[PDB]
Amino acid sequence: AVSKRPFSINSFAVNLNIGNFVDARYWSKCSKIEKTYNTGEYSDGQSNIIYTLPGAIKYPEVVLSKAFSPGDEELINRLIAVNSDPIAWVTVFIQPMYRDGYYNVPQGGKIILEFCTVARATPINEIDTIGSNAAMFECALNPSRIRSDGGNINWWSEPAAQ
Amino acid sequence: AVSKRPFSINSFAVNLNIGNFVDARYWSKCSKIEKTYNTGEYSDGQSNIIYTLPGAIKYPEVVLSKAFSPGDEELINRLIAVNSDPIAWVTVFIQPMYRDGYYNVPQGGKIILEFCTVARATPINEIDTIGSNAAMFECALNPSRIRSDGGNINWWSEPAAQV
Amino acid sequence: MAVSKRPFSINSFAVNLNIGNFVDARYWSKCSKIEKTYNTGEYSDGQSNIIYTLPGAIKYPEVVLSKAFSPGDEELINRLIAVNSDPIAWVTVFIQPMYRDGYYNVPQGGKIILEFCTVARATPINEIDTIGSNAAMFECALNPSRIRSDGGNINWWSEPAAQ
Amino acid sequence: MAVSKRPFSINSFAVNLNIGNFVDARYWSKCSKIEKTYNTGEYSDGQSNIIYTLPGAIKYPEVVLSKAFSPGDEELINRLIAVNSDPIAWVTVFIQPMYRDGYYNVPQGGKIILEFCTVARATPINEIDTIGSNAAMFECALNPSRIRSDGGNINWWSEPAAQ
Amino acid sequence: AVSKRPFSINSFAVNLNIGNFVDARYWSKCSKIEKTYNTGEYSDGQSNIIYTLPGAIKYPEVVLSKAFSPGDEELINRLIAVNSDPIAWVTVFIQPMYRDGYYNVPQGGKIILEFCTVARATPINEIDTIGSNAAMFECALNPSRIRSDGGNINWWSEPAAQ
Amino acid sequence: AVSKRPFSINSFAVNLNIGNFVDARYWSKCSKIEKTYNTGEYSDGQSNIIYTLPGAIKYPEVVLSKAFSPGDEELINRLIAVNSDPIAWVTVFIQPMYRDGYYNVPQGGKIILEFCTVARATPINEIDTIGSNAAMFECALNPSRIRSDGGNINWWSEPAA
Amino acid sequence: FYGQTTSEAFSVLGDASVQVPSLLQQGLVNMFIWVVPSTIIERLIINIKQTAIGDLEATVALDTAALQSSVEEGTATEGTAPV
Amino acid sequence: NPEGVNCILNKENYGIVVWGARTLSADPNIVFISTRIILNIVINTLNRGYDFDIFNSVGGTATVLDNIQRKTNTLLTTLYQAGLFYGQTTSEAFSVLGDASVQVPSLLQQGLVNMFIWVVPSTIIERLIINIKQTAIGDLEATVALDTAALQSSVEEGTATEGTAPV
Amino acid sequence: TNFLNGVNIGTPGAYAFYQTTQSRPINVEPFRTCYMVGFASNGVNKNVPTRISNLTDFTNVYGTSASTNSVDLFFKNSQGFGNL
């Protein structure tokens, strides 16, 4: 029963809100997105099995990447300056969509990595006068929270006081 | 030569019971299922041979993976929220069969990983506008026990006090 | 001089198990290396700046057996899982070297016997992949305490004993 | 016993397409091999050094259709370019075996149906050469997911799905 | 001088047993029948000559072909189903003969490939609406053993005791 | 300008003396042979350059290997028993040569690893009923000294008085 | 539909081999369809057995073997219905 | 027991057990009831298989004989996989001859078909003999080596049975 | 010889005997034999080379003979290998 197709790796669009700036540049790559649980070990004393206790949630670092193109000087300066303001935060918007060229079918809302701090800004991955790969802008972010609000699926409802 | 053809790596069906929720989704991949014994070294004093002593059984972390498809929003939410309830835990059901296509012919019960805690939920393994692989939804689980009850083979009968 | 006898091949051994009081008739198609390892300490004689090695604390490293996971392995799973629960129970490994062509084993010499082995790891399923085509791999790690041989004429392993 | 009924020729098969909700009226004059492939793994029973092959991970290989690029193929091109954009849309291939002398096809049996096919390639023009005299060939590559047959008194690809 | 006149490439009849049911169809083409020894390298230490050690016997894949004709529907529907049953096997029977027309002259037993698994089933080699070749049914089998049973000549005998 | 084609990797024959037993089996492989110097750092105080001071000579462990063939049970037992006697030692003889086939033409003496202790005996590197490689007997040895006594060319001469 | 596949769910027959020229001249076209509709759960029966201490695994093995063998042989329904 | 009487015994720690598996035959080849049952199973399996072949037209090709040989092979293969025969391969297990080269047209006209089968039935363990030596302290390995070499050589070159049977 | 002990037993079951000395026969190849030309009063095998299994067999067949010491020495030194 092959009905609705599964999302592909290319089936997402990534955007950034850098402080008070709504950056319009689209990013080509992103790393994995999870909710990681740190763990401790324990026993109930009635057995010799090691039981795992979750704790100290963490959302691991996310590495965005794109092709370094003119007009990226604004993005470079914004990402270099965002951390200077303790009120300033970086927000990551990931909209899934069924992509075909420039055609897309966005369904559901958009994952939002909220309150992210910049940990690394690499405008040039490397320089090689004989190389032919596209220069890559990279940016590492440490998110604090994840939510979803744009649409009609909302697939990151964290537990709350219902 | 051979009689019964051995199980293939594709010869298992994986299902999840997330808390009080029974999920109809099937997972395409699962890591290895083990019962490890932590070991301590000792000697009997009569020789210089190092002897190994089992103890502190552990069932290692198991990583399930599947293709990230619509309808997995509820699965993501349930897996994210399960650990918030101290009573709730995840159960993994693995039934061995001999699938031709959609023609599974299962025999024996199913290996049940009981009392599992989520350690990692990764809806998207990565993003690449030039990539062509299917996005992978991964979930890491820490099981506490293994058993089997729904068939006529019972391939994980743990030791018990048999009077 | 000239090769009168062709050497043993990697496939030239038959592996069997004795799990506690049970004699398992199943054969294992893979086994790791068999060793007698010496733990070494460094010393000097005082007349030179050369570092001399001193053997001691013999250890026989862990041996990993592997085979194809097929029906009828549930008894093997249960026995391997339960053997360590009895302090009197051990696992014995019998390796018979031979010169088989097909099903035409030609066993000459005795069998190397890993005596008094404790289970350290039991993995009925090495991996699950609904798209994979490899055969599911039963694995078992054992910690032997001693090695000997008793059967046929050739005594492959003889530990030094009083003359 | 003897030759009473002549076998099918390579030209004895008419190819049709369904592109999403579009029933295409055009015919295809060339289709590649129709296959069911079993990806194979290797194993041993431990009683011999004979290599045994284990089937698994069925896949129906890519099918390449070709025809003469003629006016009225613009809608076919625009449909094939757009099928994959819709996650619900699929390509269905219909092959009817017949015994056509000229335009007097004699259909016997049902029609083989390749269901749930995705477009991997669309080549409106195989090549251009103002000196060439061959007919321009429109090609399309399809990755099918299933095969069956339902169109007549003879069913060619009954799966063992029926338990 | 020459007397018995040797075998021709057409001097064999090929038959199949698919699971528990006996196929009455014949195959007009079969690939090589072989026993391959995977070889290992070693040295005796007395010379730099490379020695080869046989091991890990295998019987390579065998491709059977015939003319796709009505009546092969059951053959297809059963070659599809063989692997689904872990008990079912495909057995290949090759009878060497000295046929003129329909006047086969069998001599010796029939070579039997035992315990074969289906790796490939191709009812239609290709379609060409203006082609003239005969449609070619193909089937690839991975055999596990070879023997010879039904005659006064043992065409194949694996080493055994006595 | 090259006259003598140099020694190849296949240009050595390896033999063992296990305790009081002169073992006649030849080994197919051996690891690297060196005289390694452990080092300490220092300075002369008049500059910021780190100077190296040799010390604590060591001869690194040598791993011999061969094809596991019948008649190797004697070798297995001897190598398993040698360390049991504190007087017993293992000696490794390496004769360089220029063998075409069986036509070795030794030139020079034979390098001798004297007073070696067994650290590891592996009669079977692994088992696999589908494998085709030759089973390998391995033996790890810790030598104490190196010399050479046989033919004209002395290869290893430590600094004596 | 009931079935893991379309070849288990439905089947169609509407080609020209089932059309009659005389009816076509009148404007008639005949189509033949077969379908296997899905069913529903109406009554669910719980057959639960009470086991002594210790013998649960053996009792389960025996009873499960018997039940599975009966179902696969089709002998499960061969009997008299109790009220 | 050598006369074909199978006894039933009340063994302590075991219960009531049959301690005999011999037939009434004087033929040494069918001494054990297991061999008789194995042969009967082979014969009855083949007969039930051929019951479907009875009353079948013998067309021009005479393909029915080849089909019968095929069916016999598959039937006996499953009996080998069950384990009724001795050996390591079907070649050592059984053999069949049912082609048209053994069919006489004169008999076919009457409706007679001849099939020839050879099988090697599995044997059993009846009495188990323990021949154990009592060595002095120290010479265990040497005595074992010598005696094992002697026994293996004698068995290998067939002189093991050469010798008188005690009492 | 260590294999026929259970032949003359009708009842099924496990039985125990002592492991006796088992003779290991020789493979037939040149220079595995010694031919002793001697005399015995009883002309059992006059001018006929006869295999001898041991000194006891020699005495039983030929009785008294001046070659008895030579036969005993041969068997003691050969230790069951080689033929006389």
Author numbering:
A (entry chain T), E (entry chain Y): 2 to 163
B (entry chain S): 2 to 164
C (entry chain X), D (entry chain Z): 1 to 163
F (entry chain W): 2 to 162
G (entry chain B): 423 to 505
H (entry chain A): 339 to 505
I (entry chain F): 2 to 85
Question: What text does the study give?
Answer:
A-1(L) is a Myoviridae cyanophage isolated in 1970s9 that specifically infects the model cyanobacterium Anabaena sp. PCC 7120. Using cryo-electron microscopy (cryo-EM), we solved the structure of A-1(L) tail machine, which consists of three parts: a 205-Å-long neck, a 1045-Å-long contractile tail with a complicated baseplate, and six pairs of tail fibers. The dodecameric gp2 portal, the pentadecameric gp5 and the hexameric gp7 sequentially constitute the neck of A-1(L), to which five neck fibers are attached. The long and contractile tail of A-1(L) contains 24 rings of gp10 hexamers that form the tube, surrounded by the sheath of 24 helically stacked gp9 hexamers.
